[PDB]
Ligand binder design. Structure first.
Ligand SMILES: [Mg+2]
Ligand SMILES: [Mg+2]
Ligand SMILES: [Mg+2]
Ligand SMILES: [Mg+2]
Ligand SMILES: [Mg+2]
Ligand SMILES: [Mg+2]
Ligand SMILES: [Mg+2]
Ligand SMILES: [Mg+2]
Ligand SMILES: [Mg+2]
Ligand SMILES: [Mg+2]
Ligand SMILES: [Mg+2]
Ligand SMILES: [Mg+2]
Ligand SMILES: [Mg+2]
Ligand SMILES: [Mg+2]
Ligand SMILES: [Mg+2]
Ligand SMILES: [Mg+2]
Ligand SMILES: [Mg+2]
Ligand SMILES: [Mg+2]
Ligand SMILES: [Mg+2]
Ligand SMILES: [Mg+2]
Ligand SMILES: [Mg+2]
Ligand SMILES: [Mg+2]
Ligand SMILES: [Mg+2]
Ligand SMILES: [Mg+2]
Ligand SMILES: [Mg+2]
Ligand SMILES: [Mg+2]
Ligand SMILES: [Mg+2]
Ligand SMILES: [Mg+2]
Ligand SMILES: [Mg+2]
Ligand SMILES: [Mg+2]
Ligand SMILES: [Mg+2]
Ligand SMILES: [Mg+2]
Ligand SMILES: [Mg+2]
Ligand SMILES: [Mg+2]
Ligand SMILES: [Mg+2]
Ligand SMILES: [Mg+2]
Ligand SMILES: [Mg+2]
Ligand SMILES: [Mg+2]
Ligand SMILES: [Mg+2]
Ligand SMILES: [Mg+2]
Ligand SMILES: [Mg+2]
Ligand SMILES: [Mg+2]
Ligand SMILES: [Mg+2]
Ligand SMILES: [Mg+2]
Ligand SMILES: [Mg+2]
Ligand SMILES: [Mg+2]
Ligand SMILES: [Mg+2]
Ligand SMILES: [Mg+2]
Ligand SMILES: [Mg+2]
Ligand SMILES: [Mg+2]
Ligand SMILES: [Mg+2]
Ligand SMILES: [Mg+2]
Ligand SMILES: [Mg+2]
Ligand SMILES: [Mg+2]
Ligand SMILES: [Mg+2]
Ligand SMILES: [Mg+2]
Ligand SMILES: [Mg+2]
Ligand SMILES: [Mg+2]
Ligand SMILES: [Mg+2]
Ligand SMILES: [Mg+2]
Ligand SMILES: [Mg+2]
Ligand SMILES: [Mg+2]
Ligand SMILES: [Mg+2]
Ligand SMILES: [Mg+2]
Ligand SMILES: [Mg+2]
Ligand SMILES: [Mg+2]
Ligand SMILES: [Mg+2]
Ligand SMILES: [Mg+2]
Ligand SMILES: [Mg+2]
Ligand SMILES: [Mg+2]
Ligand SMILES: [Mg+2]
Length: 204
RNA sequence: CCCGCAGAAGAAGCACCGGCUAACUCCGUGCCAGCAGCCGCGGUAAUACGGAGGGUGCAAGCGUUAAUCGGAAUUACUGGGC
RNA sequence: GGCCGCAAGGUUAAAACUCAAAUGAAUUGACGGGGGCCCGCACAAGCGGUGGAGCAUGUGGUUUAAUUCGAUGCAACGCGAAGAACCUUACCUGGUCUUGACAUCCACGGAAGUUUUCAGAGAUGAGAAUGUGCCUUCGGGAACCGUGAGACAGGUGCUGCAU
RNA sequence: AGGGCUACACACGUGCUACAAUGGCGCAUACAAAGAGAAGCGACCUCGCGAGAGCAAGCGGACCUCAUAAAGUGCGUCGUAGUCCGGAUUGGAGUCUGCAACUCGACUCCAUGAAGUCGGAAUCGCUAGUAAUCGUGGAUCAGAAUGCCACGGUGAAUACGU
RNA sequence: CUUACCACUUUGUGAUUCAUGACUGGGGUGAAGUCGUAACAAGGUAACCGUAGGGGAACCUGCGGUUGGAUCA
RNA sequence: GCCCGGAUAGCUCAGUCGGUAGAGCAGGGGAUUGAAAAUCCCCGUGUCCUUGGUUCGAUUCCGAGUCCGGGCACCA
RNA sequence: AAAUUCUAAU
RNA sequence: AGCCAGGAUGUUGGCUUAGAAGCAGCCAUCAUUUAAAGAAAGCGUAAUAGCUCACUGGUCGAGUCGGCCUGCGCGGAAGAU
RNA sequence: GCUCAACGGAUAAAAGGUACUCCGGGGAUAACAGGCUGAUACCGCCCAAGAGUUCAUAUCGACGGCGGUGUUUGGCACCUCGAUGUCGGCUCAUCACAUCCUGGGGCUGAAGUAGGUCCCAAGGGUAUGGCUGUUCGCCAUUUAAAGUGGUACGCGAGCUGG
């Protein structure tokens, strides 16, 4: 079904130096909940918040049944209380933003299967004498699925050009796929997180 | 226009009640929902939001929006200043 | 945009948008690494300590079924507590009760109390003798008991930012 | 009814005892103030190494009890060593209060004998019968103070100055 | 029939006005971020004006000017 | 493809001369402050890139391998 | 003679 | 080898899922009437239904079905005056 | 008394450029083309885990295997250095079939229109432009279709010279 591990990250919203304290308190709450469930919590990224807790904490929770119970904590959490960084005795309202995202794999494959490649061999252009004329040293590879084209005529040997262009095509495919995944994840996190403004909230 | 007929028989709504501005209490929500012409209300004991009871102002009308003059001596001839 | 200048630029001179203010003089305080005059074991001169060690005690944190609650700059921390084995105790686990542990009202059968026996961790439940009197117009009423309903009791529950 | 507030990798505050010779240990002997006492204070005598136990007068108290003050002084030993300093921790046997001392009391005897050899950055109290040091009593309380509130003994150094 | 005037229409080259344009320069607004502390007291180097150079930024320095500057027992 | 150089704490980096590894920043505890910085005191390091070998003993010496940095790849 | 800072509801 | 006939009984099974009934996939794979019939070799239904095959009686009437050691041939076999 | 280590040691004593070049030779030796080969390139076939809702072979084919051609890049250095002119375009062609269209069929997860795949077949036919010196390639608009290759990767005693 859906019981995979999860990533929990909380960051400050409105308030500044006291939203960091509330983020620390909220992280401590979640950590104690995880500990009294036979789960495991480990901190990957921490940005301390000058006075108190963390301006942003990103940790990974691992167990059986994690995401199925922590997927409802993604949103805004509002706190109304007397801050520690308060000379007078005023009550202040602040907020924090929480994001919970499931753990998903990173299956990457060498999508360089030659059954879906078009290879063109032709003559290079430049100054090479009577040998550059009567030889097919320039190479070009077109990837049928993605549609990327890479052409190479660096060295006099066709095999070196073929290898170099094949490596460049693989690198370009990898970069495109990684950029796609990164933008999808960023958009999902942006929609899940919200914008800490003490007016969009899930609990008080 | 005049006379007769039957029966009170056929005929009341709109805005507002914190100050400016005449007119107050209860319940619901809890910087949310909402109100506002200017100051400004609402953070779990709200005469300012929503409903009820009461009151105030106009009335076959009542309110809102647009436009002009006045207040504005705020282009100062009457009648201002450095 | 125009004029002037080698250039740096000068000169004439708007609009959109945004706020409900911006400003001058003086007034009462507060503050100054501004100026004078003073005081306090506040500095200076001395004496003895604390921070190091072992132990007592309180607090934070952590743990736990609970580790009850409050104070938590100077002005909280041998503080409320002028004294936690049971009690205190307000916390946790388990076993129990519902006008009721603590008061008044109404009705019904009752002197109050003394010795015991069985079951249970105890709360409690069941059983048997024992005294059945005290002012009482011999109508009765009354210190005090159990039951039956409800007006009510009960709260160390929250708000010291309503008092 | 039983348990917890007494937990324990750690951090802080307030204190008690020490790190020794201006001292430790043994023998002998001087000088206080204040306070409490009836389900209470408890003398004498006897038993026990000791905490204590048995019998038991007096006292609602300038009369009786708690209740020998200690530091001090005289003599002797220790002779600078982790020691005849230090008294933590642990094993065994007991006394008392309390129906009930395992978690969780106080005291006693025997055995044991840890850190500690004067304390980093820092920081606290005190101007005279004060600081320092030595003993005594009371409230709470069946039992349970190094805490709190009081009482006396010995008794200093320093203040050019703001 | 022919000539003159002239409407529609056509050609070339300018002016002005409206919308739009890849990039680029500043301006305003913000109940929370990063870097410092330039000004308000002598604001800890008195402040400001004109000008020139420099620098992540408030700003610093050179020349002239002003008091709309504190202390002066 | 050939040649040279490098790999050491969390990050930038010195060092062996075959037996015993350091510096700055950072990190932990405590001081000063109403509080955060600056400042002061105390405290901790790492299988010296992977693998095989010689040695009593390898971070060091000798073979391979991975990654990083630099140079060259000309006449037709 | 040294010496930076104090967000956001009374 | 052709040709007639059978090819049955409580598995609508818990297992698994909306239904999986011989035939989606997972374990097992016994028993009964029999001359024979798999608790199923194949086709087919959303699941049923439906049609064949293993095995067995009848006709027929004499040979028939697979391996081994070897000789020679076939396919696999498309290029530029 | 020499790392005369270029170790039978040329002098005690010594680096580079030539696209401004020049002489004597070599196909004893490279670049173009031909030749042998076929690592590479391209095209077929064998077995069948599997994908195809179920079903290996409608259409694909993992792990492996066996061949063909002489279009690419190579290996060798057999011909040519007393000379075989080298890319692209133009004009003109000619052959192979591993067939782009038209022609005849089998199977389809082929209802029809349209397709997929494999056989037979070489008679005829098989674009104009933008960009670039371009071969190659991208784009615009047509066509029944805009085939793949050999010929010194055809064709300069036929043209041009980017
Ligand atoms: Mg060249
Ligand atoms: Mg060639
Ligand atoms: Mg009024
Ligand atoms: Mg209104
Ligand atoms: Mg209300
Ligand atoms: Mg209302
Ligand atoms: Mg109202
Ligand atoms: Mg006017
Ligand atoms: Mg007006
Ligand atoms: Mg005026
Ligand atoms: Mg201008
Ligand atoms: Mg100039
Ligand atoms: Mg003003
Ligand atoms: Mg003023
Ligand atoms: Mg002053
Ligand atoms: Mg002053
Ligand atoms: Mg004094
Ligand atoms: Mg002093
Ligand atoms: Mg200590
Ligand atoms: Mg507490
Ligand atoms: Mg105290
Ligand atoms: Mg208790
Ligand atoms: Mg009060
Ligand atoms: Mg409080
Ligand atoms: Mg109890
Ligand atoms: Mg306690
Ligand atoms: Mg007395
Ligand atoms: Mg001793
Ligand atoms: Mg003892
Ligand atoms: Mg002893
Ligand atoms: Mg002892
Ligand atoms: Mg010593
Ligand atoms: Mg004294
Ligand atoms: Mg400043
Ligand atoms: Mg300064
Ligand atoms: Mg300055
Ligand atoms: Mg200044
Ligand atoms: Mg400068
Ligand atoms: Mg200047
Ligand atoms: Mg100046
Ligand atoms: Mg620290
Ligand atoms: Mg800052
Ligand atoms: Mg402030
Ligand atoms: Mg053959
Ligand atoms: Mg031929
Ligand atoms: Mg030689
Ligand atoms: Mg030689
Ligand atoms: Mg030459
Ligand atoms: Mg020559
Ligand atoms: Mg030759
Ligand atoms: Mg050749
Ligand atoms: Mg399948
Ligand atoms: Mg050839
Ligand atoms: Mg060849
Ligand atoms: Mg040759
Ligand atoms: Mg040879
Ligand atoms: Mg030849
Ligand atoms: Mg010749
Ligand atoms: Mg030649
Ligand atoms: Mg031929
Ligand atoms: Mg054919
Ligand atoms: Mg065809
Ligand atoms: Mg066909
Ligand atoms: Mg033909
Ligand atoms: Mg023919
Ligand atoms: Mg013919
Ligand atoms: Mg030919
Ligand atoms: Mg040619
Ligand atoms: Mg050709
Ligand atoms: Mg000619
Ligand atoms: Mg040329």
């Amino acid at each position: 079904d859906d019981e995979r591990n999860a990533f929990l990250e909380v960051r400050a919203g409105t308030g500044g130096d006291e939203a960091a304290l509330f983020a620390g308190d909220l992280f401590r709450m979640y950590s104690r909940y995880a500990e009294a469930r036979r789960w495991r919590v480990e901190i990957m990224s921490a940005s301390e918040g000058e006075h108190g807790g963390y301006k942003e904490i990103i940790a990974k929770i691992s167990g059986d049944g994690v995401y199925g119970r922590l997927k409802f904590e993604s949103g805004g959490h509002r706190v109304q209380r007397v801050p520690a960084t308060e000379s007078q005795g005023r009550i202040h309202t602040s907020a924090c933003t929480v994001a919970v995202m499931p753990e998903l794999p990173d299956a990457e494959l060498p999508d360089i299967n030659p059954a879906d490649l078009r290879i063109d061999t032709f003559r290079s252009s430049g100054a090479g004498g009577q040998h550059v004329n009567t030889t097919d040293s320039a190479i070009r590879i077109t990837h049928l699925p993605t549609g990327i084209v890479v052409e190479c005529q660096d060295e006099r040997s066709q095999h070196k050009n073929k290898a170099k262009a094949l490596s460049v095509l693989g690198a370009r495919i990898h970069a495109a796929e990684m950029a796609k995944r990164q933008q999808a994840e960023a958009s999902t996190r942006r929609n899940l997180l919200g914008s800490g403004d003490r007016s969009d909230r899930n609990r008080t």
